[PDB]
Each structure stands twice: as C-alpha cells, then as structure tokens.
Amino acid sequence: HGEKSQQAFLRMRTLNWYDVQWSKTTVNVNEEMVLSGKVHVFSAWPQAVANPRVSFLNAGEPGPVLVRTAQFIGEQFAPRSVSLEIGKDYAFSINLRGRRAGRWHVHAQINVEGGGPIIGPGQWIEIKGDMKDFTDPVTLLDGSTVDLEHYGISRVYAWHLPWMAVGAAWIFFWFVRKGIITSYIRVAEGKADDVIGDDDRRIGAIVLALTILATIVGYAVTNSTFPRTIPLQ
Amino acid sequence: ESVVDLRGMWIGLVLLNVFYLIVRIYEQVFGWRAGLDSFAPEFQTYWMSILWTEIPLELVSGLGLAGYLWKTRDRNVDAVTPREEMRRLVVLVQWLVVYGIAIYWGASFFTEQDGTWHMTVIRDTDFTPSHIIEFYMSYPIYSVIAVGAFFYAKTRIPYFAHGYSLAFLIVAIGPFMIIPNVGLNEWGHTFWFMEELFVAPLHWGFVFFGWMALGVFGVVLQILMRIHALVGKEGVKLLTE
Amino acid sequence: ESVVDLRGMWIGLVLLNVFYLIVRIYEQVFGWRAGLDSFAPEFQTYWMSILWTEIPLELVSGLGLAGYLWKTRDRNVDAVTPREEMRRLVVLVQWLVVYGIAIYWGASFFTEQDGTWHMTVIRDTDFTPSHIIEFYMSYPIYSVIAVGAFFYAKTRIPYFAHGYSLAFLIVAIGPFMIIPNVGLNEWGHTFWFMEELFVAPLHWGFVFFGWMALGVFGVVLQILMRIHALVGKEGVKLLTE
Amino acid sequence: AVGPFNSVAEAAGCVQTVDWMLLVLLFFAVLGGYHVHFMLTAGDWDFWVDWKDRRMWPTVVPILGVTFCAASQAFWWVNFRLPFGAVFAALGLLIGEWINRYVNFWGWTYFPISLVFPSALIVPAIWLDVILLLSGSYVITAVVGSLGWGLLFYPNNWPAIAAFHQATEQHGQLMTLADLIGFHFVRTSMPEYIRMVERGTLRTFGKDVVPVAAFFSGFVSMMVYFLWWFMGRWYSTTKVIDTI
Amino acid sequence: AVGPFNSVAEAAGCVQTVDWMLLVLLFFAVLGGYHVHFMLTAGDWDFWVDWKDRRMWPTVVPILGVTFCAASQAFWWVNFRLPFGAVFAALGLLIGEWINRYVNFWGWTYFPISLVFPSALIVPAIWLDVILLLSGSYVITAVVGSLGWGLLFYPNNWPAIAAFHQATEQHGQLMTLADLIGFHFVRTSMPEYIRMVERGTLRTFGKDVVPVAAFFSGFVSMMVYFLWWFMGRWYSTTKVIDTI
Amino acid sequence: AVGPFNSVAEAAGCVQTVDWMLLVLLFFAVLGGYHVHFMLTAGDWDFWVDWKDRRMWPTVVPILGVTFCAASQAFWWVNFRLPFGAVFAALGLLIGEWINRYVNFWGWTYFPISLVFPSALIVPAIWLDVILLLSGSYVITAVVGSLGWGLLFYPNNWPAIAAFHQATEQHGQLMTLADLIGFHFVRTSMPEYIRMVERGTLRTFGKDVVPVAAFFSGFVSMMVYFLWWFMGRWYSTTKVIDTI
Numbered sequence A: 001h002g003e004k005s006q007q008a009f010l011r012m013r014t015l016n017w018y019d020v021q022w023s024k025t026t027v028n029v030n031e032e033m034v035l036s037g038k039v040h041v042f043s044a045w046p047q048a049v050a051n052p053r054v055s056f057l058n059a060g061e062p063g064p065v066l067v068r069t070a071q072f073i074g075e076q077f078a079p080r081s082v083s084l085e086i087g088k089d090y091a092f093s094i095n096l097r098g099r100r101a102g103r104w105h106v107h108a109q110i111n112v113e114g115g116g117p118i119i120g121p122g123q124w125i126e127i128k129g130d131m132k133d134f135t136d137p138v139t140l141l142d143g144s145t146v147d148l149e150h151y152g153i154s155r156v157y158a159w160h161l162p163w164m165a166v167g168a169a170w171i172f173f174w175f176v177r178k179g180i181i182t183s184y185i186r187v188a189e190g191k192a193d194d195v196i197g198d199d200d201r202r203i204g205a206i207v208l209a210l211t212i213l214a215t216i217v218g219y220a221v222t223n224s225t226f227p228r229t230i231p232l233q
Numbered sequence B, C: 001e002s003v004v005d006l007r008g009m010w011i012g013l014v015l016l017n018v019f020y021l022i023v024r025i026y027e028q029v030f031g032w033r034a035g036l037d038s039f040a041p042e043f044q045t046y047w048m049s050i051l052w053t054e055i056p057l058e059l060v061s062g063l064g065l066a067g068y069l070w071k072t073r074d075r076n077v078d079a080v081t082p083r084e085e086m087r088r089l090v091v092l093v094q095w096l097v098v099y100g101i102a103i104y105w106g107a108s109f110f111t112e113q114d115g116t117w118h119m120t121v122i123r124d125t126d127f128t129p130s131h132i133i134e135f136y137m138s139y140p141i142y143s144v145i146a147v148g149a150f151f152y153a154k155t156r157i158p159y160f161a162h163g164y165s166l167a168f169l170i171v172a173i174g175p176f177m178i179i180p181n182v183g184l185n186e187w188g189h190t191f192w193f194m195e196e197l198f199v200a201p202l203h204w205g206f207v208f209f210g211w212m213a214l215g216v217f218g219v220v221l222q223i224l225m226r227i228h229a230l231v232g233k234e235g236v237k238l239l240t241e
Numbered sequence D, E, F: 001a002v003g004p005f006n007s008v009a010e011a012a013g014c015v016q017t018v019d020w021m022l023l024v025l026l027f028f029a030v031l032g033g034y035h036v037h038f039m040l041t042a043g044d045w046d047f048w049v050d051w052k053d054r055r056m057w058p059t060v061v062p063i064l065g066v067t068f069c070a071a072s073q074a075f076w077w078v079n080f081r082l083p084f085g086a087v088f089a090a091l092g093l094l095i096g097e098w099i100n101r102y103v104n105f106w107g108w109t110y111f112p113i114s115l116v117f118p119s120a121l122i123v124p125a126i127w128l129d130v131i132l133l134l135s136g137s138y139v140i141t142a143v144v145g146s147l148g149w150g151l152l153f154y155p156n157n158w159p160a161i162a163a164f165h166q167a168t169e170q171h172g173q174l175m176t177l178a179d180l181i182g183f184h185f186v187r188t189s190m191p192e193y194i195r196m197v198e199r200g201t202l203r204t205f206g207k208d209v210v211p212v213a214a215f216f217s218g219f220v221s222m223m224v225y226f227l228w229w230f231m232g233r234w235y236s237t238t239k240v241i242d243t244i
Ligand SMILES: CCCCCC(=O)OC[C@H](COP(=O)(O)OCC[N+](C)(C)C)OC(=O)CCCCC
Pocket: A215, A216, A219, D054, D151, D152, D154, D155, D158, D207, D208, D210, D211, D214
C-alpha cells in the first residue's frame, strides 16, 4: 500500500506485473481466495537493487487479515526463497484464506534479498464474518489435525508464566527478607556479610536444585510428548 | 511535617498511564481506518496532526519545566534541614519513579510496538503511526521527565547542586539519545540495509545509548548515600540494623 | 637585552617559503616534459636525482641539528634568569611557528597535490614527482624541524629539560609518523582497496597519525604555563589583567 | 526521635515506602535499557518462532541477553548483596516482552501468540544468580555461572518450542509447524531468505548442532559477562564532575 | 620594571608579538592535521562536484569535518574562553583547500574550478562556535550545536552547487551539469562506478533524501563531537613523562 | 650470616638456582603465549612453504611476530635492563615451532621438513634487541628497531626458501619447487584457493613487490610495537585487588 513512495524508475525497471487476478473480491471467514498473476523480470536490472537471484513471493496485506495457505511461483510450491532470472517471466498464485472482517487492500509482492520490497497491483478485499470463527486447520505427519490459530499457545503459556512467577517470587522473597535501604546501609557499614550468609546460601542452593530438576523434568516430559521432531526447514 | 507525601508521584503516574492508555486505544482504533496509507488526507487528519502538535508541545513543556524548577530553586540549598532534605530526596525518588515508568512506556512498549507495525505495513513513510507515537511522543516525554528529575535534584538537594552528577547526566542524556537513530535508522533503512531486520547495525546506535539507562544505578546510589548520611548514628545501627 | 629577536624566525620562514616556492615552480615546469613517464631516462635526470639527494641530505640535516643542539646545551639550565628564560621561550615559539609553516606545506599543500596528480597519471610507479616532493621532501623537512624544536626546548628551557613532555613527544613523532604511510599507501594501493578512493582505510593510517598534529595544543599550553609563571604577580594582574 | 524522622514507626514506614519506590524505579528503566538492547541486537530472534533455530538463536540470544543481567548483578550484589540481579533483569525483559506480544503483536496486529512468543530466560538467570550467591566472586560466576547461562538456554526453552517442531507435509514437501505458522500468518517485511537460521553446512557433524551452539554461547558469555559486570560497575559511579 | 620585562611597553609589545606567533603557530598545523584527516577520510568528496550527491556527501563530510572543530573548540574554550575554535579549524581547512584547488588542481593540472571547488563549512562552524558561546557547556553544544552543524551543511552549500544541478540533454540521456563537467574534463583514475553517490534504493520514500541525510549526519555528530572534544582535551595535556 | 640465608655461599647458590628457575619459567609460557598467538593469527603461513609468498607472508608474519617480542622487551628491559627480550620471545617461538615440525609434522604425519619448516626470526629479533640496547628508550627502538624488524624478515629468510623457488616444468606448466612440494605431498584440508598469496594485481609495478611488502610490514610494526610494549607493561603489573 506504500508503493507510491518508492522511486519511480526502480518500480518500473525491476518487475513488470501483468495478468494479475483476484479470484474473489468479497470473501468470508474460512473461505479461500486465490491471487494469481505473471511477473516479468526487467532485462536492465538496476544496479541499486541487488540481483533477484534470492527473492521471496509474498502477499502484500495489512497484517494477517488473510492467511496464506499455499503459494506457487515458477510451477513450484514456494514457502521459502526462490531465484528469479533476469529477463524471464514467471507465473505465481497465492491461496489466501479470510481471517479478519473488514475491507483490506491486498497486493502481490516480491522481495529481493539486497533490494527490498517490490509491490505489485493491489485490490480491495471485503471480508465478512467473525475472527473467532477462524480455523486453519493443518494435518500432521502422524495424521492428527490441529488448528494453527490456537495450537501450542496453551503449552507456551503453561511453560512461560510459571517461570516468570517463580522469578517474581524470588525477587520479592529477597526484597522482603532483606530491605533495599537496610541492606545497602549494612553493606556500606563494612558488614556486607550479615546481609547475605548461610542460611541464605542454603535457600539459594535449594532453589537452584529445584530449578535444575524442573528443567530436566520439563525437558524429559516434553520429549515423551512430541518424540519425533525435525529442525526448521 | 510529612516526609512521605507521594501525592505528586501518584498524580504523575495516573496522568502518564491514562494518557498512554488513551494513546494506545487511539492507535488501536486508527491504526487501520486512515492509519495505513500515509498519502491519504485522512492520515493527515488523524496522524500528521498529532505529529505537528507533539514536537512544539513537548519542547515547550520541557523548557518550561526546566525554567520553573530553576526559578523556584532555593538560594541557600546548603542550609537545608535534615528533615526537609529527606522530603526533597523522597520527591526526587518520586520523580525518578515516574521517569522509569515513562522509560518503560517509551523505550520498551512503543519501541517494540514499532517492531510489530513494521510487519503490517511496507513503510509508506518515515512518519508511520508507530513512529509518531514512539519517536515523537514517548521518547521526548521521558526525556522531559528526566530533565525535570535532573533539575529538581540540581535545584533542591545540595549534593546535586554543588556540581553535575556524572551518572545523572548519563541517565538524563543517553536515554534522550534513544531518539537519534530516527535519522540513523531511517538513513540506514534507506541506504545501508535492505530489509526490516531489527538486528541491523542501523539499530546498534539505538543500543549504545540504551545502555545509558543503566546510569540510574549511580543516581540511586548517590540518593542512598544521602539517605544513609542523613539518618544519624542511631538510625544506621540502632534502628536499621 | 631584547626578548623579541625574531630574526631567526624570519630567516627560517623566508628560506622555507622560498625553497618550497622554487620546488613548486620546478614541478610546474617538469611535471610534464620528462615528469610523467617514470621509465624515460629524462625522469632519472630530472626527478630521480632529487629523490637520491633528498634522503641523505635531510637525514644528515636532522642528525646534525640534533647533535648541534645537544652539544650547545647549557649544563646549568636550572640557573637560567627569568629574562633569559623568556627569551628562550620566545625562540621556542619561533621554532614552533616555522614548524607549523612546514607542517602546512607538507601535510596540507603537497599531500592534497598528490590528489590532483593521481588524476593526471596512471601511477607509473611509487616514485611519482608528487610522491618525491611530498613523501620524501616535505614530510622529512617538517619532522626535522620538529626535532629541532623538540631539542631546543630540551636543551634550553628547564621545564622541558627535566623530562619528556608528552605533548611535545606526540607533536614531534606523530607528524613524523605521516611519512611512514608510504608503505601503508603503496602496499594498500596494490593489494586491498582498488582505486584512487582517498577515502579507503588504506589511508586511515595516515589519518590516525595526522591527529597527532593536535599535540601542539599541549606544547603551547606548557609554553603559556611557563610564560604565566615567569611574569610575576605584577605582570599577571597589574598589566595583563 | 531518630533524625531526621519523628519516631521509630515513621522511620520504618518511610524506609519501607522508599524501598518499594526504589525497587519499582530500578525495575522499570532496567526493563527499558534491557528491552532496547535485546530488541535491537538479539533480534527479531525473540520475535518469530520460525527464527528460533538450532544454531543462531541459542547462540545470539544468550550472548546478548547476559549483558544487562551481568550489569544488574554488579549493581545489586556489590552495593546491597541482594542475589536477584540477573533474575531482576531477565524478569523485567520477559515481562515487557510478554506484555508487548500480547497487547501489540496479538492485541493490535493479531499475530497469534504461537508465532510471537518470546524465549524463556528465567532459568539461566536463576542459575547465574545462585552461582553468584553460593560463591562471593563475580570471577567464579563469570566462568561457571555464565557457562551454565548458555547451556541452560535451549533445554529451558525446549518445552515451549517443541510442539512447533512437529513435522507436517505441505504439497509434497516437509515443513515444521513453526515454518507453517510463519508461512500462514503473512508478515509484510519478513521474507524467508532473511531468517538467518541454520541452513546447513559441510562441516557440521550431525546430532551435535545444539550442543555445539549452546557451549559456544556458554563461554562467549564469560567475556560478555566480565565486560558488562564492569560496565555495570561504571554505571554505578557516584562521581560528580565540576563542569559539563 | 615588570619582570622579566624592562618596562610596561616592552611587556605589552612582547605579549602582542607572542600572541601573533601563537595564533599563526596554532592555525597552521591545525590546518595541517585537519587537512590530512579531511583529505584521507572525507574524500575525494570535497574534490569532485560530481561526488557532491544528496545522500553520501552531506552525510560523510559533516561527520568527518566536525572532528577537528570539536578538538579546537575544546582547546580554545577550556584554556582561553575564546569562542572561535570550530571557526578556527573550519577556516584553516577551507583556506588550505581553496589555496591548493586554485594552485594545484587548477594551476597545475588545469582542472576547472567548477569541478574541484570544496564544500562550504563556515556557516556550520559559526553555528557551533556561537552555540558553545551562548552556552558554557560542551554537553549542550555537543547536542544542539552539532545537530545544527549537520542540518546547516547542505543549505549553506546549495548556493554553490545549485548551478551545477541544472539539467542538460546529452545524446538522448539526461545528465546534470556536474555530471557533464566530471565527464568532459577527463580524470584518469576516476571512473563513474567509484563515485559512491546516491544511486537509489527501494525504500527511499521520495522528496526527503537530503533531510534524512542531514538529520543522520548532524545527529550522529554528537558522538563524534564528544569523542573529539575529549581527544582535544587529551592533546592539551601538560603531562611530562620521566622516561621514554 | 646474610638473612634470610645462613652464609654467603648459601645465598649465592640459592640466587643462582632461583635465577635458572626463573629463566626457564619465563622462557616457557612465553613460548606458550607466543606460540598460541602466532599459530592462530600468523598462520598457517609458517606451516607451509607454498604459503611463503612475496606479499602476504612477509607482511603478516613480522607484524604478528613483533607482538610478544615487544612485550618481552618491555618486561625484561624495564625491570632488569637485560637486552634479550625480543631474542627471548623469538628463540622461544623458533624452538617450539621446530620441535613441533620435526616431532609432529614430520615425526607423526610424515610431512617432509622442506614443506613445514618455519620462518626465521632470529636476525630481526637481534636487531630489535640491540637497537633497544644501544638506545635506552622504547620510543626509538619502536621506530628504528621495529622498522628493521620487518625489512630484515625477507633477507634473513631468503637463504632458507631460495632453493624452493627454482623453476620446474610440470605437464607444460611452470611451477616452483615450493608449489610442487605442496602439491606432491597431499594435505587434505589445504586447497590451493586458500593459500592467500600474492596472485597479482593491476597496480603492481615491476620488481618491487618484496620491498613494498617489507616496508609496509616493518614500518607498521611500530604501532604494534607500541601497543604490545605497553601491554607487556600492563601484564607486568604488581597490583593486588582486594576482592574478586
Ligand atoms: C541442561 C539439562 C537439561 C537438558 C538435558 C538433555 O537431555 O538435553 C541435552 C540435549 C543435547 O543435544 P542432543 O541430544 O545431541 O540433540 C538434541 C537436539 N534437539 C534438542 C533439537 C532435539 O539437548 C539439547 O540440545 C539442549 C542443549 C544442551 C544442554 C546440555
């Protein structure tokens, strides 16, 4: 939507969009629309923009108002970066899915590694429905189906929030057991040994042992679940 | 009379938090619906007006706060009584509490809110709604608060009046140096690096002056020195233990 | 007898300026017409002769100046009279004035003349006429003058005789550490950076030691300390105010 | 009467109130500095789940996160002997990050939390604080404490990111759940090529990428811990200059 | 008699003569150091009119030029309260540059002055010196003074380079007058690709390249101003070491 | 009785034994630090005869070798006036390198000595030590001494590597003996592209590559010599800190 501010000669001498079509102008939540088109890579690629040798196909929209279920370019499924050869023409298609109700301006966009964003034609998409009715869903290798809108968030909360609470409890325990002004004065008066000294170190070592045990137990427990995982592709 | 007053601190905290909550609601409502395209006149109506109002208002506020604190200073700061000096130290701590809250709002909340806004738009201009809220409201606001905090100590407490506290200067200027890379990120985001990578060295000048927020350590230590010196021999040992 | 003599400074200034003006005319005449091609025998006749006569002559001149100033030193420098000490300070200032003129001639005039010469030839060799004039004549000349200025103060003024002034050491060595970049340039101008981009960090070694020219600040400050001490209580406040 | 306070009760109340005020005053703006530094140096790796790889993320994040933890430890331990400095900094950073993820990344821009959740640092911070507590020297906790700060990063973050490393099949291609989440919820200015993740290499010897990265962040932290402990010492200066 | 001078008139004459000698001695060799530094860092941007672009030149030149101005301000203001240190350094640089441009670039190599004229710096130097004069602190003149030092570079240089940005048509291709001058008067070792000028970028949101560069150059300058003020303070040392 | 020794002879014997012990104690671990630093910075240029080119080798090796020589000179001369610090460091490095080349490179891996012999440094070290001896100041030996340190590197290494620069013809292609030795005796992880040697450039002027490299390397060394002299002074600190 900000393509107006980009320099004119770079806009007209990098990518030449044509045959750009939007399958539907008005879409519902959980309804699929396809944005497709063809793009021509200018033969006289500017020196300012790096080579399109590393580039990514993207849908230019104000946030994830439309969830991208699949996108293709050059007759290839392209969830990762792709190479565009100078002077060639490529056909692309993005399968979008309505997520947020409203009127959104959705562009076709390709990003070059050393150049930045190149924004193609954009069309107003009207989305009707409610956000809470949105489900992706996706299927795992084992055959189970999950909803990416909500999957994994509960586990992340259940692992993160308790540890933040534990840290806050540790801070408040040491703050109430020894005051800030009180301990500062104590340390400044030479006696910075009755401010912290076993049984204080015993409490610290108990906390550390419990933390290590929880980390090991948590790591082992989350290895029983999801026993077969793969690195980021 | 009353060493711990806290009415000023409560008023400042309430005002700042309510104002920032109002700003957050406003940008929730108008981030879309005339907050996306910077060339539409509705953007000028709803966002550029804020930008034009911000800078002169906060410049006037900071200059007036400094001038009022300078003209309201006592000329016999040395002859302050221990109880009045405790009251002034507590007021300074209230100032610094408001300062820390403002720093959290600006350097932490809106600064990383700009991160999520960068993934929503393609950066139509340098004056995005996030940039307007972050660069031109919150950073000047907390620098103004630091100026008030720095000048209160310079003009009410004899320890900070006899010279310039290096830690106080750092905590007043370095966080006021969290705005500079608006020139430098933008020039970096327009010349050096190509994508919206927050790891860019174009964001590293943001960091070197973000370390200056640690200058509050020395300020708090000096305040504690003043407090511990004021409480008598009975206060340090017999009472505080 | 006469504190302000100035005859030596005038003689040195006239000699140096006339010599450099003669060199400038010579290289105006012979920059072309046997100056461009470095393999022609006429280049050896007109330019390599200067290079061969430069290094021994300036080396001998600097060593002899140091030796003469060391053998002419007074062994009772602590017993110098205030009038004689002021005269010696004025002579040191004269030395420093000649030094500054030499620094301008070498580090500023011919160094940037190398810039315009690099745009006229394709660098037939390292011993271009500009390189011969700049690297091997002007830089050694002003380093020799700095040696003379340094050794005069070491051997005439008690303040500079009881130790080594750090600022004087810097202003005597670091400017002498600008010629050194002959290698940092030539090796740099062959392997790393690849064109007459003066900005290249193959020249940043030039710059770091070019900053040492600021060491004259401490030298003149020490001279002024001596002057302000030499004038009695009547000189400072009755006359100078 | 205990000068400059009227009575013992007044002095105790004043001390308690000023203690609370100082605690809040430091916690905030330590949050500020730490969040600025982590946000603009450590990424953009905490931002996205598809950025939390096996090599760059567990190397970059601990190294740039130990900084303010060491500085705050230097402030608290030297002047108060309070053993919560690294936990102080880490809790502040995590609270600020979580607030901003829920309110702006999800509340404003509607990015699902599964995509924008931050990395856990509480466990390494606790390890660092206890090592500084059981010992009395920053030198020891610089070496062994910060070594565990790096080795404990991935294990304590595994419970939150493992669910997103489950394999899925998309159009005849293997993709992780994190990759799918990043691909589905479109980010405008975030292409795939910039992810700066482990993309493979000819001299990685399989099944030890994470152990190698975790150790690497372990001792590079010691250098960073040392430098930032002394930087926190410097920021704690009480020096007053005559003129500015 | 006013020791160590015979009379009051002799003392006044000696003081005046030594004042003149000191002024010349500092002005030269401050010119020397500053000219070396500017020549070998700031280019080669002051050398050629076709290098004076809208982004790099108003960025590089002010940042690299504020150095000796700050150092000279530190020397003069701290030790004499004389408010001309930045003007001192800038005037020295401009005098040396103009002399050598006229004598060597044009007098020797017959390069037209329109091609090799330097960039004006008197206005930013005056701004810096007055800001240090109206204030009394280098901290203030570091920020407000050096911020104006960068914002004033292009506006005070525009009158000299506007005539060379007039458009001309050469063989069906638009070129500026400065480009034509650089192309006409051949320089051997100066190709076009090395010019290091604003060549465009996909995120330069138009109509603001010069304002963006000015704010970057001017507001980065305070780091350079601080560093070089303190370097000038160090160079002003009177320390005498016992041995070498 | 000469306290704390029983007699004069006992004191003399104790002093002699402790002198020998201290000499060995410093020689080793100066060998250690010097060898670690030189091995991991200066290559890998001492390792291979086909790496000892005319530009990179006489540039890299002397610059990174002058470091510990300067540091050990600072230690020995300042505290003992003994003029062998540079020779101390260089002899330690040479002895360690030769021992490793013969015992491991040749004894273990059966690489011929003609391939893995190190570069000579005794002559430049002697020059540096004598210059520090005739003078009494590190400043002079920083300039004249370390200038001769680099200019003497190639001439004192030429007798060792000249025999390997004899031309040979291999399959219609010119090769040096050093190249042939590096090619005949296969090294797994040493492709030719890694060699980082003088491969030519369009601004190399005939017959002066070695003089240019030696002057560059040798005359830069004064920066390194200064830095490492003062670093050796810092490592010679007797400071005791109260807490860790
Ligand atoms: C630190 C105590 C808790 C974790 C103990 C454990 O079994 O984890 C070690 C294991 C070692 O890696 P490995 O089993 O070789 O490969 C597992 C890789 N992942 C975690 C991506 C499946 O997992 C890690 O990579 C965590 C980082 C190193 C901590 C010592």
